[PDB]
Amino acid sequence: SLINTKIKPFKNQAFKNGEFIEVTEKDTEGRWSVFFFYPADFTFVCPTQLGDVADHYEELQKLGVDVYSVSTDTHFTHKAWHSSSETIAKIKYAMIGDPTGALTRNFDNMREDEGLADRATFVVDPQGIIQAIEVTAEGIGRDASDLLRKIKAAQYVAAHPGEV
Amino acid sequence: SLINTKIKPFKNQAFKNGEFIEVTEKDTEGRWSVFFFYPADFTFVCPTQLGDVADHYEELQKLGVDVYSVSTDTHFTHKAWHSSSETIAKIKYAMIGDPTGALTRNFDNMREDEGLADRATFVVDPQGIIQAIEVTAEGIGRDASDLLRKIKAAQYVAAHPGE
Amino acid sequence: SLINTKIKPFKNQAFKNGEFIEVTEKDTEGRWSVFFFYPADFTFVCPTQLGDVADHYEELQKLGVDVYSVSTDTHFTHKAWHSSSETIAKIKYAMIGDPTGALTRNFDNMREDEGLADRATFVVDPQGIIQAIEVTAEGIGRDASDLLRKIKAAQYVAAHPGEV
Amino acid sequence: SLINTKIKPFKNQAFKNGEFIEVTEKDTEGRWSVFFFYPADFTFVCPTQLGDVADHYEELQKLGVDVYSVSTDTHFTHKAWHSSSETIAKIKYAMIGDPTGALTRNFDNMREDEGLADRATFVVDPQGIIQAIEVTAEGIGRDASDLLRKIKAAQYVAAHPGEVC
Amino acid sequence: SLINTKIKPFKNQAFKNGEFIEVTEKDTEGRWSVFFFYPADFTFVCPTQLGDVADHYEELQKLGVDVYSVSTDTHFTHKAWHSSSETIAKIKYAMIGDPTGALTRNFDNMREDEGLADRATFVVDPQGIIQAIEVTAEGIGRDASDLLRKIKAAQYVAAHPG
Ligand SMILES: [Cl-]
Ligand SMILES: [Cl-]
Ligand SMILES: [Cl-]
Ligand SMILES: [Cl-]
Ligand SMILES: [Cl-]
Ligand SMILES: [K+]
Ligand SMILES: [K+]
Ligand SMILES: [K+]
Ligand code: NA
Known about the structure:
Five copies of one chain form a homopentamer.
Chain A: E1 11-16, E2 19-24, E3 32-37, H1 46-55, H2 57-62, E4 65-71, H3 75-84, H4 86-89, E5 94-97, H5 102-106, E6 110-111, E7 116-117, E8 119-124, E9 130-136, H6 144-159
Parallel strand pairs in A: 3-4, 4-5
Antiparallel strand pairs in A: 1-2, 1-5, 3-8, 6-7, 8-9
One potassium ion sits between chains C (72-73, 99) and E (72-73, 99).
PDB class: oxidoreductase
Keywords: peroxiredoxin, PrxI, oxidoreductase
Assembly: pentameric
């Protein structure tokens, strides 16, 4: 896996709370980040995983954690999904579009025969180092509460080296 | 250009008139086909170009011509766009999703730095041979009635070799 | 296709209005240009296509658009054709000869088995960028009216970034 | 990642309930499997993690799930750790030795500059397909109850595909 | 040079006395052939050399010699040049069009940076063997009577070894 490696440079458009923005690796420097990949917009399972992160987003932000969801759809499509779905409408974090697949390939997370990212979550520290990875097949679900736990533990170890 | 070359094999998912189907090169064999590429769903310009073609679709179907629109979006996204845009809702031809880019690259039509297809139309005859190509940059616009003229001309020449 | 790519340097002889001239990419810099390729002089279909563009040439010039017709014949052959055909005699734009096939290959438009150019039209903006392309098989025909519409729309969006 | 790929063949010695045994991919066929990698025996953090899985092992076995822990130590070393640590002593699942690192590298899970496996857990279905992956850095810890939840969810979607809530 | 080598196969359209024909290597087999290359139709200098050859054409025909002029112009252009120029109009042999340059390149006679053949004449015997080569720069002429000299000689040595 990519554990304990540094994230690679990237530049992507995103939809975030009603506007289009550009995100690059420079935006992650000095911050905690979650990169939350999923296969496709306008599908039936993904929203509740994304929705579960949205439910925890206020707490994450208090911990100084930025959240970026990523699929190979465009930011135009994310904006439409956000208007049309009430689960997605509660997302206030950045929804990155990755239609070249470059961000997804940076995280070695592309299904090449489908052109879609796998269901993978990466926790990245202020120095750009991947501290946790979770990947699941369809239907197995990613629990945002267990994600919060890992982030708090990763922040703890960073602040107090030499104990778990 | 790809003019007078044979189209390449492909297999894609599509949204067509309320259902999801698979489209391959074998469905084009023995028919006239239009492959109408565009950059992205849920943008502002593309729909009236696609809608133009939809207006002419009954006539095209009378001439034995199938229409396939293509972008690197998914068929899921095409279905959503079709339910949200009054213009896209008119479309009764297949909307192919090409998220791997393979179909777009077959037609040498990928903007690689963007992962989107360029605005290109290809007219393909029942033997798979590309008989007309049109490509435009943003803002310039494709005229569906010029497309029909070219299709009719292509069919005439097919039916009156040497003239 | 070559859409949104920059034209390549070239140097060719041309017949224009009784004179032999040299055309290079420098003549296209800062101008709109139409490169109108065709297979062969002294054939029977091509004159109509070329004559139709000639009919629009006054207006194209008014709009700051130069026209170059191109085949793999020589500029000598173009001069003769201009004397013999009254449709070709209408032509006041440059008729480029491309016997090395180099200009035709710059535009990826050679039928290599015949040594003749395919029936292709390229619109090139003042920065040398290809903004529109049309290629047709024998007998289908290019409509100069649609060409004129396309040039006007390309000029419009150059002048009004974002809009139509 | 390796998600949705088939596990590669392997053959390794292991210590399990007072015996040395051989384990290969054939032993995993037709069963749910958990491959629990950790860096090194006779260290201080690892055993609480192995112990947590040990606590949940009876429940895992009633779900038809086999557990294999893996480090690049030998099976001899596992046997000795099992005699010396009261925490490791409660392990009843197989402790696989991977001194060549081949089982670790099959799962793309080697820290090459240390020759130790990273802290990764893989859930493998009865067809050999990897259905869940978790990897953590030191100190972050792996929650065996969250593992059990994922295993039940994977069993559920296997039994009832395309079902949607 | 290509002397004493066998010509390569080719397939070209030509204009010959009011009509269009295909010429291939097969049409030279069993016959003597002259391939007369020139740079371009509808220029000033070339017609006299082609004319010079035209004058001697019935004589050649009675020696068993087929004539083929070649430029990288098309046969459409050759037809047109025929109507336009009195000189060219008196040609009765085949004017081959070589727009792909392949026939020219078979005889290694392409000026690559112009896409035009050089001024070269090749004599080919019934077995396809090149027996005489002449190449001249612009302005220096190619005199047809010297070509008849060379051909008659070439035929002598063929029927009378040594
Ligand atoms: Cl990974
Ligand atoms: Cl093309
Ligand atoms: Cl092109
Ligand atoms: Cl992995
Ligand atoms: Cl030679
Ligand atoms: K895409
Ligand atoms: K030529
Ligand atoms: K070791
Ligand atoms: Na994959």
